[PDB]
Design a protein around this ligand. Structure first.
Ligand SMILES: O=CCc1ccccc1
Ligand SMILES: O=CCc1ccccc1
Ligand SMILES: [Cu+2]
Ligand SMILES: [Cu+2]
Ligand code: NA
Ligand code: NA
Ligand code: NA
Ligand code: NA
Lengths: 620, 620
């Protein structure tokens, strides 16, 4: 009955039938994106209308369309033809992954380049990489992918160990033409393999690890109702899944006494980008938006009990659409479980004689996605004490190149002749805030140092200052770790028992933001990534920091265009967009498969409660 | 047989007898510190000599002494009388905790102040606080404690809820004189209780938490030999315990093939300080060095199975000396266990078809200490992939004051009339480095942004730069989160298979350092805390960043004096001192007992291995 329930197979089948009957899903059509729309502001009418948004690609060259469908009423609500030179191309299709390699295999320029390197075309894999927007006028309005080649010595070989440097091709995947083949010179193909399951490389496996058994003999402490509604240790929320964003959290609230208090209306990772810092023309165009260009939700892994998720695991299996509108289940795509988290609070008092210890725990909601060489785990954590935390876990295989004789300022050496270009992994979290309701504001909090002198005669005092962000034009903020800068989201109309506004404090990791020159293509297309914090006024259609159609969009879409409206954000319905990321100079230890590295953020209550919210936790 | 073994009860008894027979431990003497000395550089002689360092206090006013004893030979090696006006007072004794309250209870000025507030002297607890060095000439060379008062309504009451503001006293604990009583005015004593086990405050305890069972049916994967030598998943180390520093890690090494490779010779938390930022004369002198002034090891908790440490736990019970030289066991003072740590590495490859997942784990070595209102957990973690991490967990009860009518810029309000002054918790980690041996150097690594132009025509390139620190005078460094600054400890004479020097990278949390004015007393006494990173040349007697005798030392001891020697540190036996800390503006949620907050640092291999060191981890 909940409007936030997961999409069902029956809903997707109905969408398929509605589109087909309306003449919008002929043989030349492909669904590039399909997702349920959230209820509009003011769902207190019980008049449920399950609407779906669809992007429809046409493989024959016709204009793509954006379509909204009501499954509740069985109708097409709107259908708009898209001018992609203007508003951007549609996301990459899974079925285009193979097309780049296949088109290149019959191109005489490509075959000539492989012949000079004595490479068998049957052994050459081509990565299907998004194109961006650069100097090539013929690409405007065309659906382009760029290809970089890797050799597989045999079908089970890791091709990433054998990059073919000095060679790149550009392909129009609709007209099926190779537009350019660029060969800047022959590099030796690195010869060592990177097969991390080969006994010759691993050596004998360890026999020293003894098992760790994690069980819950009375079952878990959380309940799941309505398919995706979670209740756990005073938390309440709905777990959504979208093919673009992946796991989405709705209606995060905390039961404080007899009151259900909202905190976050919607939380998601709304974009991520991996810009490369190698100036070689073979790779200097390389920036992929895994979320906006490739759709991370459609590549979610099926997670194995005991290997991927350990303990008493509750799975969700979300349903998505394939390219033809058929429902497809991602079996065991989302893991949910609680974890012990050490000491929560402890004190032994010298005067009262009372010894007190309590243990902490967290609820974990996670999925894992794989897009080419990279694999990411997305983890949301809820803690007993009101803390909310996000963590991204990056692993997989680093993207490789040749390592030039004589070295490089922009590439790390991993093995003889094998390089890994410098790059970043930058995420955008979109937090549609609802601290005790929708009237919220953001304050920037800095530590204040004080000079020794009158009123501070011993020079020990220090303080803090809070600056309210009142309009969108002043709500683009940078980190300052040295001044301990944080941001507080508060509700000026909801006070705690001390008559102070209730709030939550955002703690960033203060990692570097986008390093590219501000005049670069990527700085214009990923403008969100140049600043740590943005605050906008809520609007239905302002969903992604990069805009709706990221692929081959010329720039400036999304957050820079939204904030130009300069709307009032002082005690209003607001959205916080937090940029955070890893800067990766690859190390030898990252090869041939990378141990996990992590980045994230957290939010902690700041006078939201009238005292510690975990006084009623029992003594185990 | 190992020279790094824990002190035994028999060793401490022998020290007691040696001191007694030498005439150094009469009835007026108290042992303020006793600890084993590490072997000198060049222990490859097998000529073991277990030596102990002792600080001896005299309650009758005689000069204290520093004494070194050889238990192996049964002799006093050296005994030096200390001039405490020059070199500092000895650490606070546990038996002095009671003396401040007892002396004040018979002082007419103190009783007059309590009478005006209608407080029963029998209900008034006095915190025994270290004095520092300020404007009071009569304190030089005298052993002073300062007292702040708190009311206990009944024996099991939390006195921290009832601070008596506006009142402070100074006491000479040797002459047993109250030197000053300062009363700046009457503040209401906050009336609400803070009893976190009272059902009226907790409400009904939760019944919703279901058990989490963590067991190891085949036992743990680590072995303990010789009492304190650990071997775990290619790691090797010795777990030490010192009454001042607490848990100390010796001889951290990693078994890489058939080679045992050193990484860290000695790791410890060598000082910690809590400076307060309230300019009221009642508290503006308040800065306690829990390690250097109070000795955190002697207040280690006995840790309970299932509550403090959960899983298959191996305990160590270190032995320390009491004030009379009797051995005292801290039963179950150190917990050791391994923990599952999620995904280690994962990839599903689109071209090879191979799906690969491995799980991570960490070895945990921890203890918990309690000094007055504060409780801290110290955690050392070793990971499968070569990462070493330290984490401090801060909990307990915040130090309180009145909350002034009309507010404060330096105090948070926690309850009606109840304040908590702003403060920091700042730690110093001393890392006696031994990356593949003792010839090490430190490089500072910054991200380098590049301008769009020739050789970077698309404005995407970025790089890194490394600066070698060659002499101690240039080895005092600050964090720079915006440039991604890290520090690499490498061995220039030990190369990996790519002919690059092996190394480890230190990742800081980049939290603010000491906020006090640089002309303040605390800035001079805690100079280490003003900078994020110091590198010194190893020397036997350079043990603590604050010097040997921190209590009432006038300033400049420790690191500022060491680095003035300007020694060569480029490929030498070096020590890294890392400052890290929390800046605490207390929140309502911290009251009446604070949920854990954390801070720390980690070190990750940086070309130390020839490839990922966890290829031989099996598939669970
Ligand atoms: O992560 C998206 C870029 C990509 C896609 C497919 C193969 C390699 C790299
Ligand atoms: O943490 C050392 C300062 C202290 C000691 C005893 C009681 C309260 C505070
Ligand atoms: Cu990376
Ligand atoms: Cu604190
Ligand atoms: Na355009
Ligand atoms: Na909002
Ligand atoms: Na002095
Ligand atoms: Na060293």
């Amino acid at each position: 009955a909940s409007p936030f329930r997961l999409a069902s197979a029956g809903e997707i089948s109905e969408v398929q039938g509605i589109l087909r009957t309306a003449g919008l899903l002929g043989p030349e059509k492909r669904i590039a994106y399909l997702g349920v729309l959230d209820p509009a502001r003011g769902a207190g009418s019980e008049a449920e209308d399950r609407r779906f948004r669809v992007f429809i690609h046409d493989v024959s060259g016709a204009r793509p369309q954006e379509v909204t469908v009501s499954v509740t009423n069985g109708t097409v609500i709107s259908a708009v033809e898209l001018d992609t030179a203007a508003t951007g191309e549609l996301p990459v299709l899974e079925e285009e992954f193979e097309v780049v390699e296949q088109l290149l295999a019959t191109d005489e320029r490509w075959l000539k380049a492989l012949a000079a390197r004595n490479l068998d075309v049957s052994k050459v894999r081509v990565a299907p990489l998004s194109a961006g927007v650069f100097e090539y006028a013929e690409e405007r309005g065309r659906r382009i992918l760029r290809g970089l080649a890797f050799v597989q010595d045999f079908p089970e070989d890791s091709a990433w160990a054998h990059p073919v440097d000095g060679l790149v091709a550009y392909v129009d995947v609709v007209s099926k033409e190779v537009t350019r083949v660029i060969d800047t010179g022959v590099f030796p193909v690195p010869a060592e393999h990177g097969n991390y399951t080969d006994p010759e490389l691993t050596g004998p496996l360890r026999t020293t690890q003894k098992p760790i058994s994690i069980t819950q003999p009375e079952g878990p402490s959380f309940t799941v109702t309505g398919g995706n509604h979670i209740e756990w240790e005073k938390w309440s929320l709905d777990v959504g899944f979208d093919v673009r964003e992946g796991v989405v959290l709705h209606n995060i609230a905390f039961r404080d006494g007899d009151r259900l208090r909202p905190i976050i209306n919607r939380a998601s990772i709304a974009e991520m980008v991996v810009p490369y810092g190698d100036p070689s023309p073979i790779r200097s165009w390389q920036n992929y938006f895994d979320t906006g260009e490739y759709l991370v939700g459609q590549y979610a892994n099926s997670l194995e009990l005991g290997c991927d998720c350990l303990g008493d695991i509750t799975y969700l299996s979300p349903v998505i659409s394939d390219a033809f509108g058929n429902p497809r289940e991602i079996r065991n795509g989302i893991c949910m479980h609680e974890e012990d988290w050490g000491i929560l609070a402890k004190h032994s008092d010298l005067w009262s004689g009372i010894n007190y210890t309590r243990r902490n725990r967290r609820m974990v909601i996670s999925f894992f996605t794989t897009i080419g060489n990279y694999d990411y785990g997305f983890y949301w954590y809820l803690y007993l004490d009101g803390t909310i935390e996000f963590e991204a876990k990056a692993t997989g295989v680093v993207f490789t190149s040749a390592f030039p004789e004589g070295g490089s300022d922009n590439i790390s050496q991993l093995a003889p002749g094998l390089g890994a270009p410098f790059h970043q992994h930058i995420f955008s979290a979109r937090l549609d805030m609802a601290i005790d309701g929708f009237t919220n504001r953001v304050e920037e909090e800095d530590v204040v140092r004080q000079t020794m002198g009158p009123g501070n005669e011993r020079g020990n005092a220090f303080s803090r200052k809070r600056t309210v962000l009142t309009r969108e034009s002043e709500a683009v903020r940078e980190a300052d770790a040295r001044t301990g800068r944080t941001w507080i989201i508060s509700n000026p109309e909801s006070k705690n028992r001390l008559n102070e506004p209730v709030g939550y404090k955002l703690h960033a990791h203060n990692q570097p933001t986008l390093l590219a020159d501000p005049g670069s293509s990527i700085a214009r297309r990923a403008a969100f990534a140049t600043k740590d914090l943005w605050v906008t006024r809520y609007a239905d259609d302002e969903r992604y920091p990069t805009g709706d159609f990221v692929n081959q969009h010329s720039g400036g879409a999304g957050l820079p265009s939204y904030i130009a409206q300069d709307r009032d954000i002082d005690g209003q319905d607001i959205v916080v967009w937090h940029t955070f990321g890893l800067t990766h100079f690859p190390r030898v230890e990252d090869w041939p498969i990378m141990p996990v590295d992590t980045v994230g953020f957290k939010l902690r209550p700041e006078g939201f409660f009238d005292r510690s919210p975990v006084l009623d936790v029992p003594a185990n």
